[PDB]
Amino acid sequence: LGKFSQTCYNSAIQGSVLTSTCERTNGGYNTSSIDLNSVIENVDGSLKWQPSNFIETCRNTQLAGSSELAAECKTRAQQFVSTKINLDDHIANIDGTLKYE
């Protein structure tokens, strides 16, 4: 996965955004940016890659009650345990639409 640096140049980081000029297949280049805020996180002082999902390691997701997300998730030891999280913590109703905050 990755390896963008091998075929790009003039890369730069400003805040959380990476910008670089990269080679296209048919030749030529394109400059683009990517905001790393949603894929990298600070875990106790160390930058780590953020998981893009939890459905890959959790199963049987269910809505418990009116706002609880329940599921069986795998531990580091690869065993499934019961867990839940209150969606009311961060999911709000903004004028009729569900939004994270």
Swiss-Prot record:
<dbReference type="GO" id="GO:0050688">
    <property type="term" value="P:regulation of defense response to virus"/>
</dbReference>
<comment type="subunit">
    <text>In solution exists as a metastable domain-swapped homodimer which very slowly converts into a more stable monomeric form at room temperature. Under physiological conditions it is unlikely that the dimeric species exists and indeed the monomer is more active against HIV. Interacts with HIV-1 gp120.</text>
</comment>
<dbReference type="InterPro" id="IPR011058">
    <property type="entry name" value="Cyanovirin-N"/>
</dbReference>
<dbReference type="GO" id="GO:0030246">
    <property type="term" value="F:carbohydrate binding"/>
</dbReference>
<feature type="disulfide bond">
    <location>
        <begin position="8"/>
        <end position="22"/>
    </location>
</feature>
<protein>
    <recommendedName>
        <fullName>Cyanovirin-N</fullName>
    </recommendedName>
</protein>
<keyword id="KW-1015">Disulfide bond</keyword>
<comment type="function">
    <text>Mannose-binding lectin.</text>
</comment>
<keyword id="KW-0430">Lectin</keyword>
<keyword id="KW-0930">Antiviral protein</keyword>
<dbReference type="Pfam" id="PF08881">
    <property type="entry name" value="CVNH"/>
</dbReference>
<dbReference type="InterPro" id="IPR036673">
    <property type="entry name" value="Cyanovirin-N_sf"/>
</dbReference>
<feature type="disulfide bond">
    <location>
        <begin position="58"/>
        <end position="73"/>
    </location>
</feature>
<comment type="similarity">
    <text>Belongs to the cyanovirin-N family.</text>
</comment>
